Design an enzyme around this catalytic site. Structure first.
Site, short mmCIF file in Angstrom:
data_model
loop_
_atom_site.label_atom_id
_atom_site.label_comp_id
_atom_site.label_asym_id
_atom_site.label_seq_id
_atom_site.Cartn_x
_atom_site.Cartn_y
_atom_site.Cartn_z
CD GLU A 67 -2.33 1.29 2.77
OE1 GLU A 67 -1.90 0.51 3.64
OE2 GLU A 67 -3.32 2.03 2.92
CB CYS A 123 -5.04 -1.05 4.43
SG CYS A 123 -4.69 -1.18 6.19
CE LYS A 163 -7.94 2.54 2.87
NZ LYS A 163 -7.19 1.64 3.79
C1 LIG Z 1 -4.93 -0.44 7.82
S1 LIG Z 1 -4.74 1.07 8.01
N1 LIG Z 1 -5.40 -1.27 8.93
C2 LIG Z 1 -6.37 -0.50 9.79
C3 LIG Z 1 -6.59 -0.51 11.36
C4 LIG Z 1 -6.72 0.71 12.35
C5 LIG Z 1 -8.12 0.90 12.97
C6 LIG Z 1 -8.32 1.82 14.16
C7 LIG Z 1 -9.52 2.59 13.68
C8 LIG Z 1 -10.21 3.22 14.84
C9 LIG Z 1 -11.65 2.94 14.62
C10 LIG Z 1 -12.27 4.25 14.96
C11 LIG Z 1 -13.66 4.06 14.46
C12 LIG Z 1 -14.50 3.92 15.70
C13 LIG Z 1 -15.78 3.45 15.07
C14 LIG Z 1 -16.40 4.71 14.51
#
Ligand SMILES: *C(=S)NCCCCCCCCCCCCC
Ligand SMILES: CCCCCCCC/C=C\CCCCCCCC(=O)O[C@H](COC(=O)CCCCCCCCCCCCCCC)COP(=O)(O)OCCN
Ligand SMILES: CCCCCCCC/C=C\CCCCCCCC(=O)O[C@H](COC(=O)CCCCCCCCCCCCCCC)COP(=O)(O)OCCN
Ligand SMILES: CCCCCCCC/C=C\CCCCCCCC(=O)O[C@H](COC(=O)CCCCCCCCCCCCCCC)COP(=O)(O)OCCN
Ligand SMILES: CCCCCCCCCCCCO[C@@H]1O[C@H](CO)[C@@H](O[C@H]2O[C@H](CO)[C@@H](O)[C@H](O)[C@H]2O)[C@H](O)[C@H]1O
Ligand SMILES: [Cl-]
Ligand SMILES: [Cl-]
Length: 509
Positions: free
Chosen positions: A267, A387, A335
């Site tokens: 990515e 991702c 994406k």
């Molecule tokens: C590639 S970037 N893998 C991704 C993982 C990180 C995820 C953390 C995201 C935080 C979620 C916040 C959303 C809360 C629900 C609205």
């Protein structure tokens, strides 16, 4: 007796729920104790028996919190190394995020007690799965939602794995919640009735794993290379890093030209606007085509829109044989699902200023279409997810096509360090290859880079945190799995009649 009297205390139930919630984290990778999912679910279902509805919501919140507090606390790593905020707020955000996901578990708990308060077999095998399906669906959807840690993913190598090709991973969520419930009912009521169901239900889909919904095509077998650039996150988007990153990826690829027909970079591997790298991309494409190889790589692309503004995309481009590079090429993927705070800020007018966590390099992006065509490379179709998108099983299935040869996903998991996050992520990706019966190619920056087989098996992988390239032979497959023809409207109709039956009963009394 007294033991019962102790169990009966609410505070005792809250503490037990924490331990049973946290126990579930053990079910996912890297730990892979698939029984821990049944244990953790049993605790949630049993611990809520015989309580006032609001009482049960508090237990469910604690169970969720135990699970999300132990399971997704790795987010803290990405917040700490690059968030640029003081210690206390960093952990406050991690606990806040766990609390938010816990509301959905708690809400499940609370409505289940109100409408079905008697600890009945209807309550735990017929209302709970359907209501879990709704609440778990809600957790994944609200506010661009986060569906992490669904227990069906822990069954990738367990007995229930033959069930995902037919109905998807949420069907396994459904059955696991159901079978775990009959066990909980058996204990508390010391009745062998739920026990004799739970083991048949559990073991009934064990023979499903033997159905091969796909046919492999060894004629089309190809040598594929994926290069793990291992660019440190602190420097990845530094402008002085670009030449070195280009040298790293180029030098690794040129000796494989003419040996590997497909070469993949992870990515946003090329950390520059596509329009700024035309000489590199053009010369690279020419070199590839002369040797007979094709290359698929991530890149950032700011592109002019109808209203004379620029949408910057997190994109994959293809180059080389039977995929000639052009800035006008349609052979690309943008994406669609963007990670909150990572790729976009929810209130930038107010939140971008606060901290370098709310301003991270490249964290304004636009979203590509929900449905996009396969990447075509030398005759190979590639269904692509970038991702995080790979964990969205319905979205990957909707982009999937019958003529798809491989699933492709490229990712940069360098944010999470050496935590369990990358493994949870890697495990969920495996479910997509099992659900759709095609190999999956996973190219990452330093995260788990691997080839996954059509039955979800791992064919090859390389170690983390190293700069090397995985080259192996991979063979495509054809044919459509039941889940591939349907999506998951059928689990939803099951959820629907099950939910209907339950509301009528809780409406009878
Ligand atoms: C590639 S970037 N893998 C991704 C993982 C990180 C995820 C953390 C995201 C935080 C979620 C916040 C959303 C809360 C629900 C609205
Ligand atoms: C009977 C009584 C039982 C009580 C209830 C049990 C509750 C369970 C409790 C906890 C569950 C597990 C929670 C783990 C905690 C998070 C992991 C951890 O300890 O920290 C991390 C350590 O975690 C680890 O275990 C290291 C992981 C090593 C990775 C290698 C493992 C290979 C995995 C293979 C996966 C199998 C392949 C299949 C995958 C598809 C530290 O990492 P860091 O990046 O340096 O910083 C971390 C800062 N957060
Ligand atoms: C109320 C409900 C939510 C409230 C709590 C919110 C707290 C936020 C918690 C977690 C969000 C932090 C996520 C940071 C992880 C980084 C995400 C990310 O960017 O993943 C990207 C990969 O996808 C990183 O790859 P990159 O292209 O090299 O970097 C580009 C920079 N955008
Ligand atoms: C009151 C509690 C009742 C407990 C049992 C009731 C359960 C029944 C509720 C809704 C039945 C859903 C009707 C089936 C619709 C089938 C059509 C369909 O397949 O659309 C699906 C998507 O659309 C939907 O299914 C929407 C789901 C409806 C959720 C119901 C909304 C509940 C609102 C609050 C509920 C709170 C609990 C009750 C409150 C007292 C297919 O796409 P996907 O797989 O979901 O993709 C994932 C996207 N993130
Ligand atoms: C006691 C339980 C409490 C529950 C927790 C309380 C949270 C309250 C916030 C509810 C607000 C809902 O606001 C929510 O916003 C996002 C967009 O921003 C919507 O979702 C939007 O993005 C999603 C991402 O898949 C699209 O697929 C969807 O079609 C779109 O409309 C949610 O469907 C909407 O409902
Ligand atoms: Cl009963
Ligand atoms: Cl060509």
């Amino acid at each position: 007796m007294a033991f019962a009297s102790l169990i009966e205390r609410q505070r005792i139930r809250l503490l037990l729920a924490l331990l049973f919630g946290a126990c579930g984290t053990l079910a996912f990778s890297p730990y892979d104790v698939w029984p821990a999912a049944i244990i953790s679910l049993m605790g949630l279902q049993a611990l809520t028996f015989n309580r006032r509805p609001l009482q049960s919501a508090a237990i469910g919140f604690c169970w969720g919190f135990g699970l999300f507090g132990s399971g997704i606390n790795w987010v803290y790593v990405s917040i700490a190394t690059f968030g640029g905020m003081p210690g206390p707020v960093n952990i406050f955000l991690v606990v806040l995020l766990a609390a938010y996901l816990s509301l959905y578990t708690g809400l499940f708990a609370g409505v289940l007690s109100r409408l079905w308060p008697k600890t009945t077999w209807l309550r735990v095998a017929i209302a709970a799965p359907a209501l879990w399906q709704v609440t778990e669906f809600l957790r994944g959807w609200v506010l661009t939602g986060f569906p992490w840690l669904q227990f069906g993913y822990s069954q990738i190598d367990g007995p229930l794995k033959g069930l995902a090709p037919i109905m998807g991973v949420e069907a396994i969520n459904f059955l696991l919640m159901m079978v775990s419930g009959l066990l909980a009912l058996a204990l508390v009521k010391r009745n062998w009735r739920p026990l004799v169901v739970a083991v048949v239900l559990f073991a009934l889909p064990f023979p499903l794993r033997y159905i091969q919904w796909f046919t492999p095509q060894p004629e089309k077998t190809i040598q594929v290379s994926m290069v793990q650039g291992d660019i440190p996150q602190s420097l990845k988007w530094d402008e002085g890093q670009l030449l070195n990153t280009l040298k790293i990826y180029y030098n690794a690829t040129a000796p494989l030209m003419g040996k590997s027909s497909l070469i993949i970079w992870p990515e946003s591997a090329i950390t520059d606007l596509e329009i700024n790298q035309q000489p590199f991309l053009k010369a690279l494409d020419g070199e590839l085509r002369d040797k007979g190889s094709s290359l698929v790589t991530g890149i950032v692309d700011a592109r002019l829109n109808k209203q004379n503004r620029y949408d910057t995309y997190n994109t994959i481009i293809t180059l080389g044989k039977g995929a000639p590079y052009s800035y006008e090429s349609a052979d690309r993927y943008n994406k669609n699902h963007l990670v909150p705070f990572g790729e976009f800020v929810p209130l930038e007018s107010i939140l971008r200023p606060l901290a370098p966590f709310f301003d991270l390099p490249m964290s304004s992006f636009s979203r590509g279409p929900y449905i996009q065509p396969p990447l075509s490379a030398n005759g190979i179709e590639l269904t692509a997810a970038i991702c995080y998108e790979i964990i969205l099983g319905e979205q990957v299935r909707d982009n999937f096509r019958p003529d798809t040869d491989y699933l492709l996903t490229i990712s940069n998991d360098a944010w999470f360090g050496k935590s369990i996050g990358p493994w949870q992520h890697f495990q969920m990706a495996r479910m997509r290859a099992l659900e759709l019966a095609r190999p999956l190619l996973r190219s990452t920056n330093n995260g788990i880079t691997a080839v996954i087989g059509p039955q979800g098996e791992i064919q090859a992988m390389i170690p983390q945190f190293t700069r090397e390239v995985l080259t192996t032979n991979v063979t495509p497959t054809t044919g459509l799995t039941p889940y591939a023809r349907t999506g998951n409207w059928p689990l939803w109709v099951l959820t629907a009649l099950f939910g209907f039956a339950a509301v009528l009963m809780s409406l009878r009394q």
